Amino acid sequence: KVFERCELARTLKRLGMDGYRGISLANWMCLAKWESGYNTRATNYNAGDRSTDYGIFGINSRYWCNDGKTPGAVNACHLSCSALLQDNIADAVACAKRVVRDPQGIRAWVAWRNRCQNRDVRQYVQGCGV
Numbered sequence: 334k335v336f337e338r339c340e341l342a343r344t345l346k347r348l349g350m351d352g353y354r355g356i357s358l359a360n361w362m363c364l365a366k367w368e369s370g371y372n373t374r375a376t377n378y379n380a381g382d383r384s385t386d387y388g389i390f391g392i393n394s395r396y397w398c399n400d401g402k403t404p405g406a407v408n409a410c411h412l413s414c415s416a417l418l419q420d421n422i423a424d425a426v427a428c429a430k431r432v433v434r435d436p437q438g439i440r441a442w443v444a445w446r447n448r449c450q451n452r453d454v455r456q457y458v459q460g461c462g463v
Contacts, residue, residue: 334374335371335373338362338371339460339461341371342457342463344422345361359455359458360454362458364442364445364449366457367449368386368390368391369388369390369391371389372389375391376418377391382395383402387418389422389425390442392428396409398410398413398416399412400413400414409432412424
């Protein structure tokens with residue numbers, strides 16, 4: 334599924350993402366935009382270390398989900414990476430929450446550092462009624 338901006342904003346707020354571990358909803362929106370373009374079935378293969386980024390939040394298979402083909406990987410979210418490709422984003426949201434409980438927080442994704450950190454992210458939620 335390809336979410337419309339405000340549709341996703343309202344969904345994430347309902348799922349408890351606003352302020353989760355100090356991360357504003359606007360930052361979560363910025364992350365989803367740059368990781369997948371708000372597309373739940375998006376996948377990015379990293380030939381460099383043989384891992385794959387899955388779903389709307391581009392969650393990596395080396396640490397967060399199991400796809401069985403990633404070398405020396407763990408599955409901290411206790412999920413099959415397949416669960417991160419569903420139209421229903423509940424499992425992906427639960428796993429994103431787990432990622433940010435680690436020390437790096439939202440910084441765990443390099444895309445957030447390049448495209449969202451220290452920028453005016455208000456644009457991602459303006460006019461959505463959240």
